[PDB]
Amino acid sequence: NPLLERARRFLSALRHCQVLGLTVEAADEKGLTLRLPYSQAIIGNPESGVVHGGAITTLMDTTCGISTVCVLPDFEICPTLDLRIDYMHPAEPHKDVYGFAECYRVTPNVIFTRGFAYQDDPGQPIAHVVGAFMRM
Amino acid sequence: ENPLLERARRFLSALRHCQVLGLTVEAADEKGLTLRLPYSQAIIGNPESGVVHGGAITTLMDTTCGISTVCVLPDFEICPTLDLRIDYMHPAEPHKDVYGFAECYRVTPNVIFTRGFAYQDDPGQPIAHVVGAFMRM
Amino acid sequence: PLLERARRFLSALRHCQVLGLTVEAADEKGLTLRLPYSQAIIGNPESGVVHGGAITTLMDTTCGISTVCVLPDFEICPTLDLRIDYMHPAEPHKDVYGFAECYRVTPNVIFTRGFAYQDDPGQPIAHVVGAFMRM
Amino acid sequence: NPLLERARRFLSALRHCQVLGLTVEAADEKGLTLRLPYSQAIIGNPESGVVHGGAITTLMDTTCGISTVCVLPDFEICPTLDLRIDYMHPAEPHKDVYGFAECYRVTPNVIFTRGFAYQDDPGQPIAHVVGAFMRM
Ligand SMILES: [Mg+2]
Ligand SMILES: [Mg+2]
């Protein structure tokens, strides 16, 4: 609930994500979910359903990036140290893309996070992402 | 150079969701591809402070690697990302444009592998190293 | 049969030999190897602490050999890339299992993802992604 | 000198590494060079002599790991947190493989390192590597 508002305030600070119309769907002590509307991130004909892979990447980087608020009691923006995204299969067209990330380790200066993109069930994610973030 | 530059530029223009970043193609040829992200377009926090958002540089570098496929493909096509890693060596300097360079280092029948880096002043001490793989559709 | 191929491949790997790695199962859906903990000890053997480097070998080997799940006949596919991330330490005094499944196959590249775990696959020690060259 | 003999001692205590016959070629404040003799890497026909990816993974993981001695005053083993390896091209047979690495960021609990593997010419790397390591 407070995380919900902090997550939203992180997000609204991001211009490129404004264009993409990302919204926060949920924010627990369990992690963070964001939503990418397919219509804001089309490559080519909007008639066809096709979401730019680069939008999904932004979604994931941002989800990891913001999920840091589930473990930082205060609000800060943690610069990126490392990021890997690996796509398992292409997105379905005409379907919103969700991202989930979840901090799995926290040290004095670094936060490690892991998540995935999916559409229907989290069971067969579009892609996996792992990132480390500096707090300094 | 020119034909590959024209292609790279047309390619970039299709990426509408990030056109807000003001990304430009500086150079393209058989040996690789250079894009630029103007810093004013990616500030996080106060515009007075000139700090570039990390997620902007991801886009720059995802986009750079993707488009560098033009350097090896005979025909224009847009190649979906399969895998990307970006590893930041050191923080970007504030109030300075960020450049991305990439070069394809392996081409198979359906996959192109590419390596590059972000930097600001000179390529010598890059901000971040990047490797990605792309699907020839 | 697929299983026999997995084992042949593993036996070629003359340098893992020290680790006592075995193939636990192998079907179309993927591959499970095993690292017995007595073969990867750091420090006092009575302390049963598994060396991280052994697990990295385990995961690398599992990915590299998982290519038998999709390849018609025996072939050793060179590494193109490896991504390994550790979620938490291994528990002492327990074997480590490695699982991997090919999730994409192109004419000359095979992409596999896997993880390492001890009791249940539930919360793996580590995640690994890899691509390998074929033909 | 003192780094060199500390690097050698870190490496003597690894078993798999001794079967590979890994040695410390060079070590200073700059970073760490390890050697992998080709004979110990061969998979298959020894005359054909194809060097196994796995032996190079061990090489780099170990090089990255031990390079921490350049930045740690006292002896300690730092477990791998994450590793990335990307081959530019296959190793040549019948040539030893050298692994270099150098810490580029040090944090209270994390050391980040980067390096590469090569044979004759350090400017033609067969592979690139970055890893993060924990100090306990
Ligand atoms: Mg720390
Ligand atoms: Mg192919």
Side-chain angles (χ1 to χ4, degrees), chain A residues 107-110, chain D residues 107-110:
Chain A
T107 68
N109 285 235
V110 186
Chain D
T107 228
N109 291 272
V110 190

Side-chain angles (χ1 to χ4, degrees), chain A residues 1-14 16-28 30-120 122-136:
Chain A
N1 193 55
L3 291 63
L4 187 50
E5 178 58 282
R6 271 200 287 142
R8 288 214 305 274
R9 241 188 68 259
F10 201 136
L11 195 48
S12 53
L14 279 32
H16 174 37
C17 307
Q18 309 295 78
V19 191
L20 291 169
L22 300 184
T23 69
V24 197
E25 302 292 298
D28 297 346
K30 288 172 63 144
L32 174 83
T33 304
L34 269 50
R35 175 169 70 72
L36 172 75
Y38 75 88
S39 44
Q40 290 325 301
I42 300 268
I43 184 175
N45 195 12
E47 177 193 73
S48 328
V50 194
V51 183
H52 196 231
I56 302 178
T57 291
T58 304
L59 156 69
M60 283 189 303
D61 174 27
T62 308
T63 301
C64 290
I66 299 180
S67 75
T68 62
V69 307
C70 308
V71 300
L72 304 177
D74 205 331
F75 168 90
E76 49 178 295
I77 300 143
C78 299
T80 301
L81 301 163
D82 301 269
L83 190 80
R84 76 156 172 103
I85 303 172
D86 300 88
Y87 279 80
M88 304 295 110
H89 70 245
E92 293 174 35
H94 288 122
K95 294 195 180 166
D96 285 7
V97 182
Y98 299 87
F100 178 88
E102 176 178 35
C103 299
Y104 65 93
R105 185 193 299 108
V106 194
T107 68
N109 285 235
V110 186
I111 297 159
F112 302 76
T113 190
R114 185 178 115 276
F116 46 83
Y118 62 97
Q119 273 165 319
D120 310 302
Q124 296 308 311
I126 292 154
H128 302 278
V129 52
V130 175
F133 293 87
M134 177 95 87
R135 52 228 221 61
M136 184 245 87

Side-chain angles (χ1 to χ4, degrees), chain B residues 18-29:
Chain B
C18 79
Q19 288 268 286
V20 345
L21 254 27
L23 253 38
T24 57
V25 188
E26 307 284 291
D29 56 42

Side-chain angles (χ1 to χ4, degrees), chain C residues 2-13 16-17 19-27 30-37 54-69 94-101 113-119 121 125 128, chain D residues 52:
Chain C
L2 210 117
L3 186 66
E4 306 186 52
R5 251 200 296 150
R7 281 160 176 174
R8 180 194 171 178
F9 196 155
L10 181 51
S11 286
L13 280 33
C16 315
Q17 200 187 58
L19 300 179
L21 262 41
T22 55
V23 187
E24 221 63 335
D27 44 47
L31 184 82
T32 296
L33 271 52
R34 177 183 71 136
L35 166 71
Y37 75 89
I55 304 181
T56 292
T57 297
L58 163 71
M59 289 196 290
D60 185 7
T61 310
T62 309
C63 285
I65 296 177
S66 71
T67 61
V68 310
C69 309
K94 287 187 195 199
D95 296 346
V96 189
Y97 299 77
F99 176 79
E101 63 177 333
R113 58 152 141 44
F115 54 92
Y117 69 95
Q118 280 172 302
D119 291 309
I125 291 145
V128 58
Chain D
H52 181 230

Side-chain angles (χ1 to χ4, degrees), chain D residues 61-113:
Chain D
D61 182 38
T62 311
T63 306
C64 283
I66 293 180
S67 78
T68 57
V69 307
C70 309
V71 300
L72 287 187
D74 326 285
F75 171 75
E76 66 174 293
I77 292 172
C78 295
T80 302
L81 289 173
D82 80 85
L83 202 70
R84 321 253 183 279
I85 311 188
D86 297 280
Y87 288 81
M88 308 293 101
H89 66 255
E92 313 160 55
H94 315 127
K95 300 185 167 172
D96 295 345
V97 181
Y98 297 83
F100 172 81
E102 170 185 40
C103 303
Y104 65 93
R105 183 181 313 104
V106 183
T107 228
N109 291 272
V110 190
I111 302 174
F112 302 75
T113 199

